[PDB]
Amino acid sequence: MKLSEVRKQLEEARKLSPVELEKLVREKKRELMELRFQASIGQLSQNHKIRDLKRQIARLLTVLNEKRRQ
RNA sequence: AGAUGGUAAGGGCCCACGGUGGAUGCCUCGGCACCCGAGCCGAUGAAGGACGUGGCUACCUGCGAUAAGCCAGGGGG
Numbered sequence: 001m002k003l004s005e006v007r008k009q010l011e012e013a014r015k016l017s018p019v020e021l022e023k024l025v026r027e028k029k030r031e032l033m034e035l036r037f038q039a040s041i042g043q044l045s046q047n048h049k050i051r052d053l054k055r056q057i058a059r060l061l062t063v064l065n066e067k068r069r070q
Numbered sequence: 071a072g073a074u075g076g077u078a079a080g081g082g083c084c085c086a087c088g089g090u091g092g093a094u095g096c097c098u099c100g101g102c103a104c105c106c107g108a109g110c111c112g113a114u115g116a117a118g119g120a121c122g123u124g125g126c127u128a129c130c131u132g133c134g135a136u137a138a139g140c141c142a143g144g145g146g147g
């Protein structure tokens with residue numbers, strides 16, 4: 001997404017505990033599956049949202065992997 | 071009576087223009103040689119692979135369910 005929103009996403013993710021982080025990823029993964037459904041019926045005009053959520057999930061798992069590895 | 075020509079189904083030689091074919095010249099993202107530099111990787115799972123991976127994705131490249139990418143530092147504008 002926008003570069004400032006990535007930065008804010010990383011500040012907030014880093015204030016989350018591993019349990020919060022897992023629960024967020026589980027939520028964003030659900031929304032990603034919702035995006036794939038929508039895109040498969042031709043309903044996702046804004047297809048950039050699929051990639052954005054995928055990288056979001058990557059950042060969150062990266063920070064989750066950070067917090068179990070200081 | 072005598073004699074000499076017009077005939078071209080087709081063919082031959084030459085001239086013109088085309089078709090085919092891809093020589094020659096020019097060209098080079100490639101290659102060759104020499105020199106110099108530099109020289110190990112791997113159970114912390116190598117080399118090399120299979121299968122995946124993009125909103126649309128046959129192949130190649132990249133990457134690995136965090137999947138043409140994730141975090142940070144440096145360069146750059």
Ligand SMILES: [Mg+2]
Nearest residue numbers: 032033036050
């Ligand atoms: Mg998906």
Ligand SMILES: [Mg+2]
Nearest residue numbers: 036039040125
């Ligand atoms: Mg598909």
Ligand SMILES: [Mg+2]
Nearest residue numbers: 054055057058
């Ligand atoms: Mg993802």
Ligand SMILES: [Mg+2]
Nearest residue numbers: 074075076077
């Ligand atoms: Mg005659």
Ligand SMILES: [Mg+2]
Nearest residue numbers: 078080081082
């Ligand atoms: Mg004739």
Ligand SMILES: [Mg+2]
Nearest residue numbers: 078079080081
């Ligand atoms: Mg004739």
Ligand SMILES: [Mg+2]
Nearest residue numbers: 080081082083
């Ligand atoms: Mg003849």
Ligand SMILES: [Mg+2]
Nearest residue numbers: 089090091092
């Ligand atoms: Mg030709």
Ligand SMILES: [Mg+2]
Nearest residue numbers: 098100101102
């Ligand atoms: Mg050369």
Ligand SMILES: [Mg+2]
Nearest residue numbers: 108109110111
């Ligand atoms: Mg070597």
Ligand SMILES: [Mg+2]
Nearest residue numbers: 116117118119
């Ligand atoms: Mg390998």
Ligand SMILES: [Mg+2]
Nearest residue numbers: 123130131132
């Ligand atoms: Mg591939």
Ligand SMILES: [Mg+2]
Nearest residue numbers: 123124126127
């Ligand atoms: Mg696809």
Ligand SMILES: [Mg+2]
Nearest residue numbers: 129130131132
């Ligand atoms: Mg290749």
Ligand SMILES: [Mg+2]
Nearest residue numbers: 122134135137
């Ligand atoms: Mg799996």
Ligand SMILES: [Mg+2]
Nearest residue numbers: 054123135137
């Ligand atoms: Mg996937």
